[PDB]
């Protein structure tokens, strides 16, 4: 019934980071 | 009426350069041919700059005449019209390497017109047109630090191939175009079937080495028939006015570039610029406004560049190899086949995937033969993505270019027709921009395709690398801001999966880029996309 | 991390979702609005600084439908959405018309609203959703804006009003009406009806205005939570001394100028007064703002005309409040056309033709809510010579598309169906003269042209525009308004229909505080006006 | 309202009707013209005051055909008339060309003429009707205009001249000529002929000029009854003190500049003279009008060139009055094209190609007089580099379409018919250099390109442009004119044909009082010119 | 022939207040 | 395969001249 980011069927997030070795 | 002619071997082909007989009223004009594929390239540079001009107006018009292939145009009016997406892309292939070679300060209007008048369906006119623009600009006398060469590199049987034919490209794992001077690489545009960092770097080096024969022959043609270089100088350094601007602005601009938030920083920078100009104009009303803005821009540039070289935290507090915060979402729109919202810092792309039939496949009436396209990629950049107002009409050239770049980043993982017999259309809507938006489109597409159930081999991601270089000292930057792109030395984009590189794009604004620098950039680019792919996996790791 | 601010509420038999805070954070404000699977992403960007010499408010509304919203790939040759269709232009006007008068007088900063349809339920029309989106985004932005507004479609099934009927329900409806307004007043009405009465049409406007209050209340609650601080904006302070100097030179002359009845004469004199007054004040003081003088002079014109209306004095052309201008009706004016008519009301004139055709000739509309073939075509042309001007003769303007559709809705109620008359019919209205309402002259002209072509319409159809001057509780409703009375008045109120009912009703109100009583005086006074026009039309032609 | 003023008269075998006073009363003037059911509604709007800093006469002619005139609905996807077709652009030029020189020298108020075809008899061409309409409206307007003009089509059936032949009669005609002029002289000629002689072509011009005098007489009578008062307009008063100041600084330098034969070098110097002269005068007195200084400088240029021609001195390039520039003819210049040619006459150059096709390639023309398939296509491109300039490279402009059709009419007479050579033939002329006549070079280049492609044309074809400098009774006819000699002269007089006759004749005369004798001298001198060019063309290729 | 003078049918009214 | 005027299969030229009367 709704669109937008709150409707995400899947979700993942990361804070600012330096990549692995 | 005598043509000056120069012929030379370039790989397996004979290249012919002709000047002096045709279009004698242009600043310079060259008829370039490579085994029956011929492109007539002209340049006109205006003697006087527009009195209030503050930006260099360079325009490249690339046009394909259908009589080149013994064809009459298929359109309703039976005449060539507005350039296709292909003609726009080739016009950009000519513009990108030549643009940084005009001296800083030079703002006379320059127009390059390339017209394809004959075509061998095995020899692509794009390389021929690039050589023509290099030759015409070098002959013109217009201040230009060329000549440049141009080379397409293939990868057949694990060997590099120079300017492969259309038939030979069908067996190639690589389609790469590299342009540059005698000293350095300036431009790279490529798509690859997940090749390694060493394989991609070797292709750039190979193509730059092979194209030296083109540069040498243009140099010899210029010695014969080149018009004398224009008597042009940049505006002399005004040391007293620089110090007056610095006394009002330097300390304020140094503090302004410690503000991390883009909107807060730009607002503050604008206040500093507005107040400095207003103060100086009250002391002296005859001071040139454009000049004051140029001195102000030089301070910003020096503040940001020097902090990078000194190893201090970047504008947003990051270290040289830190990636911005990520937000990955899938299934964001209710009626679309596949949707994704990809956010990296202050850059955001709303990406959708749509499935269709053979009826939905695009028919491309192209010069080298009619072709149908089953994979469509459109990239939209509205003015609100950067908090501005503007004309929303027809794709700009830049949109076309970034739409193609994102497509080349996804192409390597797309399933063929025997494994997924459907037409796929990917649309990327850039909702926020602060660098690289085309790479955000690559990630968003990978997520939207999986959401739609498209059976790609491997998730795909990308990033843009930056550079600050003075002499031998340089720093390579991961995931650059808009400010780090404009005040930096390059935009270096790499896309690919966990196993290799699908697309590599370089836009270098300086001469003197090095094999080592490109190697460091490619290696650091790898860790960056592996970090992004890891976050993308947490959300979705298989098609729906 | 990204955090959405979400408010959901029931609206009739639907759930409306409003999301802000996570998408397009660089725009002044951005909202994702959804009504049962139908979603529109709406953004607003308002520029902080007004342009140096700006004297008109630059507001642009762009409405665009993406085909991926319906799970389709665009049918065009390029497989990409291009220039806005006739339908997208009309919906852009539906958003623009109610929001324009709510920006404060004197506000001249550039404002752009972009609405993109990203998802669609084929039973839920995106136009109402997009209007709620523009209202919510403008209210959250902090840009000086006297909203929020609501939006409601009203149907009429089983002699009962229906809120936001589905596409399937409209097949049974005798009415398709859209109304937008604030908490206090109606601002915009767009409608077509199957010849309903004055009371039935008014009840629909009142019903839809009451129903949309839940939308206004929910935007208000979202604004108190997530709204950005209201801009610190002030109108330019009233300069009483400069007003007196302009009034001393111009008011007495402008008073006599607005008693000149002939349009061409009366401007020509108004322009002489303005030129001579400004040139005299600049001879006294060269530093005076020329734009500001034009605004004071325009304030005088407005006051001269408005106060004469309220005092009960004769109008500009000498008419009384409920008098219609002179009529001239002609039939069979062009020799080779299927049907032609020349309709003249005062200084407004329309040359209207009718053309019969076949299936082949019917228009195929590739709309987002479902493909539809159109049998009845109505095109409206407004060339610059109609008002004694020179200008472009390019493609149709947004105002030409809007008025062609309004005049079409005024005629559709009397058109024979396909069993009775199996032909494609095209009506073209050429506005040869203009001084108010030209789209209502197109309605009358079409009715005569259709009968002349032998099209068996149910009955003759006609229309007029009503005006208003209102101060506090005092008001006068004007019949058949001139261009001046539209521009200096408070509304444009258009009613079209036969002897037995109303086919189309359109309102464009420039003030807050319009009343049910006022709209009813207008509707009754409009009925008498069209019965008079029909009587003259009957004398010329009464049957095919 | 008052009825319209109507004047009828016999014009050949047709009845012409002129109506004014009732339709479009807000335009400066408006006329409905009819010729046996073919009706065109023509309006004129001339702006009261000229734009403060204007220095060119802005005259626009818009010709548009409505499909309801033929009882048809438009065949396009949107079922509406769009951008003007080639046919509409060509007819707009037929109206513009004779009226332009009749506006007084120095008159720079904006004038717009809009002609709309509202009714069509498939046997009576709307172009002549629209020309009569524009003449009637301009004469009725009161805008400073030295008309009225007439308009006539001349055919040649059974070796007799036929006035305004029908489309059916034209099937038997060896000639299709249109001539327009005042009572005194011819102003414009546009024609195609089946290789007719100089005497036959000159007779057609005189015949058509004599026959159209009844149209001129009737417009004069209508102006007597219904004409608006003549505009109170004056040219700028001559300033002799300023004339002498500019001449003291420039005349001697400009005299030397117009002895420089190289075009690029001459312009370069003319520009330096004008820049230095204006800067020197604005330093003495900064209140001097820069536009006026430019006009005095142009007057000195004009007088220097013109008086040297009349005195019998060598032309700008050193040529005598009847000398043709150096020629260079080339065939098979492009490898993959069916037929190619490079034709060089002086500083005018045309790269021309020929392409053979099938019935699929033949253009379908949705013309108002009837749908039609074109098997011969001629396109003409004039890029900005041809004259050493930068500029837009979009779509064809009004002149590119005009010269493309002129060159087509120069080649049409020698083309093989579909019965003997059943192929679609496309000719593209690329103007690489320009300084007098390009489009006659396109004729030569096409003849060579067609032979190179193996197209069995009946004979080789060529052309030239003739010039004129006339003062009172003294005149000199110039052969193969420079761009300067065209702009500073009194006519452009183009003739194309084989060794045995004239295929095309075009006149654009800028003065009144051109003579039958002068036109005869021009035609005879033009004959020797093309025989000379054809002789050199024969040395290269003399058969397919 | 075209224009308003060639009208097949025609009618006209002077400025008026309609009867309610 | 080269393009241009040095490639012309046929070639003819003349100096500036007054034609035969
Ligand atoms: N072949 C071809 N068709 C075109 C082109 N531009 C528009 N069209 C056609 O024009 C149609 C609309 O009329 C489109 O559906 C498309 O097929 C073009 O450049 N080439
Ligand atoms: N949707 C749609 N548009 C078409 C079609 N053919 C032509 N057009 C129109 O013609 C243009 C094609 O480019 C667009 O403006 C498009 O709207 C068609 O089959 N479908
Ligand atoms: N088939 C057809 N295409 C047309 C016609 N007129 C214009 N078009 C095409 O449709 C486009 C406008 O939509 C034009 O740019 C042109 O390509 C017509 O009469 N028939
Ligand atoms: Mg970047
Ligand atoms: Mg009105
Ligand atoms: Mg000429």
Numbering used by the authors:
A (entry chain D), F (entry chain F): 1039 to 1059
B (entry chain A): 2 to 545
C (entry chain B), D (entry chain C): 1 to 544
E (entry chain E): 1040 to 1059
The authors write:
One widely occurring ribonuclease with such multi-functional versatility is polynucleotide phosphorylase, a phosphorolytic exoribonuclease (PNPase; polyribonucleotide nucleotidyltransferase; EC 2.7.7.8).5,6 PNPase processively cleaves single-stranded RNA substrates in the 3′-to-5′ direction using inorganic phosphate to attack the phosphoester linkage at the 3′ terminus and liberate nucleoside diphosphate.
The RNase E micro-domain was well resolved in the tetragonal crystal form, for which interpretable electron density was present for residues 1039–1061 in all three PNPase protomers that occupy the asymmetric unit. The stacking of F77 on the RNA base resembles a pyrimidine/purine interaction and covers one face of the RNA base; on the opposite face, the base is contacted by G75 and S76 from the FFRR channel-loop of the neighbouring protomer. The remainder of the RNA away from the stacking contact is disordered and the electron density here is poorly resolved, although it is clear that the pathway followed is along the central pore in the direction of the active site. Nonetheless, the aperture becomes dilated and the density becomes well defined in the RNA-bound crystal form, suggesting that the aperture switches conformation upon binding of RNA. The helical domain is well ordered in our RNA-bound crystal structure, where it is seen to form part of a pore that, in addition to the central channel, provides an accessible route to the active site.
